[model samples]
Target: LSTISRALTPSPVMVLENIEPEIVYAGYDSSKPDTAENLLSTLNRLAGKQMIQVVKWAKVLPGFKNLPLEDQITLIQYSWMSLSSFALSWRSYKHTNSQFLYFAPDLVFNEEKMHQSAMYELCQGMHQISLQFVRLQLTFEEYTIMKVLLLLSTIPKDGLKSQAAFEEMRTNYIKELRKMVTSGQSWQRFYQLTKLLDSMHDLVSDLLEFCFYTFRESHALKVEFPAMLVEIISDQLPKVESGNAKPLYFHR
Candidate 1:
């Protein structure tokens, strides 16, 4: 199976079948008395791991490897925030019904943790996604399709090295999402999910703002972020500051 998967370029149908990814953990100690500094740093820590996961899983996402090297990095960089928050919502929905932000087995955020994290509004907004998923009764298949769509969601204003191929693959995944809808149930599911996906870009813009500010002040704030993330953020911060790199949206 490993050899076959490695040698073959996966078909769209095979892509859907082969989407499993490894679990990532935020390794903060379970018993510490949490503070804004530690909490923020720990979350920054998890972001590092998840950003690497983003690249790894991108490599595994069927058509992804066919994109130009530049486009591959661009896609992963752009979607990492949205993907992290989406997975958090899914995990929270699974484990606690949005009662808290389920970051990891040891690093879940309770009310006080959110309060102390110095990012309460953002935490609430992320939790809002879990509640939304609860109302929608989001299934695993929907979750899987939504995430792939997310990686394909953002793009450079100038387009990628393989824009046509990227567009084709993105459309294919969207079709896969459309196929998941129950017939005679509603197109409303597709409508709502698409809107939800659009809305996340807005939230992620806020997250990027916060992340950039925190990163700049990490020394003063006693927060810490790690390698791939720091490099990605460093490159991203100025481009975003100059308003160059932009997200492609589903709606106006």
Candidate 2:
């Protein structure tokens, strides 16, 4: 198997499977629980050994470089998911040995530049980081904020009570977002698009806060971030700006 794999790509095993569980599970000491030091080490060693292998693999894969921007993004999403799954598995069990659970981003994702999409792969990379943040079960507000931030990477699915509730939540969220728009100096040039995405996520995070922190919401719905989560869906929704109806919906 090794010979065949290596024959095709010089070191397919190392290059393709850089993220291994047992190897990564070693860095989880209690002191550095947040950083997956062991996994990063594995990523470093494997990536360093497979630079030439990647070159060879890329050459043979049709449309490897010519793939549409969206397709390229899909590849990144799969890779990030692979790494994230191992991290979550290592951390999920309470009895899992902490002696080997230390994680370091520099080791796994950044070493020798294996994950070439560090920043440009914003959706996947940020999703991995923020999801790990959730696994750590950080403070409710922090958790809520992270959850909300993730929504920028994806769309909202209406499963909370009725679509009406979803709309209510959406309206409140948009109100807050409009506030950001009014005070759009924070992000400046990047405000509209950034806030648009952040607004969706904030609504989710606040909902979660209400659910767990105060048990206010009726359900727990989480979103998985997507790579090309548009600034607006496809083109745009038709806007029929009309007169302001007095207190028919939200009332204090």
Candidate 3:
């Protein structure tokens, strides 16, 4: 493969696949042993493992190290949910179903868990889109570029210490992504792929809002939301002067 091809192509082996069985078994065992406490422990372990994987993947991206530590943290904080959504969509492609959202192989969470919650419909909607995206049979290369695009899209203006340089880096990634998608492909294929990215842009924003609402709804219901999931959502959600956080969701 050419350098561009290799750069855009994700490896066939998933990072979490090997560990998934163990995680799922542990989760099941923990859920049976006790109620909220054990469930939370299992959830925290799985979520923390996934976040570590996310960080490792982020580190491999081109020009990521060029950003200041603060900028990097800010970008990841803002973008983690979208990034994870991309991964969730890909990892669960073969297993996509309304019954569950598989964050890892066999590490599934049922939709029933979100019953009566604020974002249940929104979660279901995004899950359907994820299944549709998988049905498109995206090449690993296409998925990788799209993931990068989503990550860059969420980098906040206020968070960047060197805005110009950050924009330049992001611009280059976008250019490369465009080149990869269009090169040696039909006009129709190019159009379809670009449209897919456009849909993903909208979906990522929608999913982020869902995450924020899920956090609030879960807490209100006394649900043991995963520590790592809460950590990521809390990092992204806006905070007020009085130390209260607010959701970005404003219905159209």
Candidate 4:
């Protein structure tokens, strides 16, 4: 990625320019190195980095952080809702950069299992986030399968495309969900699942369609989805009757 950017651009081209390479070390309150106190301080700093990024990014984005507290909660839920996205991207790049492939040419293909590996991590991360949402007691009535399908499709690829098995899984889940709905057991949790699922699915579709046309730069297509996610979540919160009811369309 870096080499391609530098090679295509003029001299002094800035590659990996957005996020700084070096870490900003925080000063510890305790002088002891690797002590419990020092480790706690380090962890605080590391965790704060993402918070800082979220806040900073939110402020710059036109309509973020402007929602009600409940909506904000939903937005954060959705953001963390997709944490598998980060892990998938990280692992994909790690596999690509591993020296094992260079040392053993036969292992080259082994280092490039981007799709299945990403799907595994994505589902796990989504399930964890879904559990947290379920714990919150949020609920809704709609196409639960479609909602989940939207979310699973909407997440950034991290170098692995969702175009192939995404639809297959969507079909399978939607069918299963319809069956569950027909069975008439566990209806409450199933309903809430659909509500949150709708929000995730809707936002993802919006973002993916945007990317289809405006693929010139990652920045152009990438940030739009999350921002729309925040907006949709904000819309969903508050009274459900407040124009936040589930839409009557799919894949639009």
Candidate 5:
């Protein structure tokens, strides 16, 4: 009886406890604590390291810290993949002319890198989004603002404790997105932009499975993950498994 009640009404403190925020000692070991297996590990290490910076980026974002801390973390965790992918796309578009994933200046994923990454199809889909960025010639303002919308576009089905603040913030970004899109006064641009946003969910949500699969087998698969990545990925698993985490849509 109390089990169901406890499940329904989760403690904010309890959720926060699940997060350690301590960077794992091994997370920075790009010095190849080293196959496809090796590339996958290092690539994941880079992404996991970015999750910390990603959280820092969120706190400074307008109105991000004002929400309940739990909600802040929840939103960040939910959208990390999309936000990470979007930032990667922007980097690739500018630096590689959409030819590579410039995850770092020193670590760029080319065609062969994709093959070696062992998740070639996912990498290709991501590169396609990078190409879309180039095709649109997306400006900094639009892409930056679009990232906030991406974070807001997904949420727990039961909603956040700061549900009001979250939605208000989300709608505010939507207004900015509309302004940015319609500044050129072209629905053609807006439709395509919204579709681009939708495309992120379709792909990365599938990527989420790989994320979970990798995390579960980190040791056996020989891939290393950070504490931050562990927390977010682990937390997301149940919500997704239970259908509580939902990606909201624009076109449909």
Candidate 6:
């Protein structure tokens, strides 16, 4: 856990307050005739930026490089959306209104776009999660740990060559995270925070459902979905068993 934690520890600019305003500001003029095109362009750019960051992060995840090349690739493919979405969530939480998610420092996505994609409820779900995370007032350390935890908590079944190895790695990090969160916090906080992890899988599932729906819509309309998004949903999103939570699929 220590080894991986060190790698995932955020840089100074990631500390929210230290983040520049220009980075978070959406630069597109909404009144322009090419507003939809601008949004697509911005989304494409943001996905590319996030893909680069995900690769860099995967390279430094302690034991990640030691895994079989295929397993390393597989892990990153499966986990990028979870990592990317949470990073966006944290940035959105920094905003006063929390109505838009900042996918890039200069690219913000409004709820109207989500509604257009038939994902208004998913946007609300993300907003709710962001609100809870912001209300916790987590420190950078806590946030980093939770981020790593979510990344490592995936089920290591199917195509993974190092299933046992990945499982062990995830177990170690979970223990370290459990110890950290429960130790220095009050009982109520510990309960709240631990419960947060429990729901993360469901939240991630919902997000992927939204992504898949959007992708299908784009394909049917003969509109281009971002290449990075195509790779993510195609290569990473799993067809796992559903839990009690009803799976929501977008319908126009």
Candidate 4, residue 101: lDDT: 16
**Over all chains combined, what TM-score does candidate 4 have?**
0.24
Question: What tens-digit string does per-residue lDDT give for candidate 5 at 101-163?
Answer: 877776788898788777889888889999999889988667777877887888889999988
- Which has the greatest lDDT? 1
Top TM-score hit: 1
* Candidate 6 lDDT tens digits, 127-199: 6767887788755556666666666656444436787777676666555555556635565665676577666
| Residues 11-89, model 3: lDDT tens digits | 3223223222231222445235444444444544566666766676666566766778777777777666666666666
- Single out the weakest 10-residue window by summed lDDT for candidate 6: 243-252
> Ten residues in a row with the worst lDDT in model 2?
239-248
TM-score between model 5 and native: 0.84
Q: Kindly indicate the candidate among 2 and 5 with the higher TM-score.
A: 5
Pairs with steric clashes in candidate 1: none
Please write out the lDDT profile of model 2 over residues 1-252, one tens digit for every residue: 588766776232233233222332223233432222333334333432333333344334333334444433333322222223233323332223322222342233322232332222332333343444344433322222222222223221222224343344444443443343343363452243343234333343332222232111212322111222121111211110121111111111
lDDT of each: 0.85, 0.30, 0.58, 0.35, 0.78, 0.59
Order the candidate numbers by lDDT, best to worst.
Answer: 1, 5, 6, 3, 4, 2
Task: Report the Cα RMSD per candidate.
Answer: 3.4, 21.0, 6.6, 19.4, 10.4, 7.0
Candidate 3 segments whose C-alpha is farther than 4 A from its true place: 1-45, 94-100, 109-119, 183-188, 214-219, 225-230, 239-252
Off by over 4 Å in 1: 1-17
On lDDT, the stronger of 2 and 5 is: 5
- lDDT string, candidate 4, 1-252, tens digits: 598886777311121123212332334333454332333233334334434444443333222233344433433433432322332222223344322211112112132331222232333433343344435432222222333343333322231133334345445555555554553455655565556554454443343333233323335323122343334334433323243323322334
Model 5 residue runs over 4 Å out of place are 1-34, 183-185
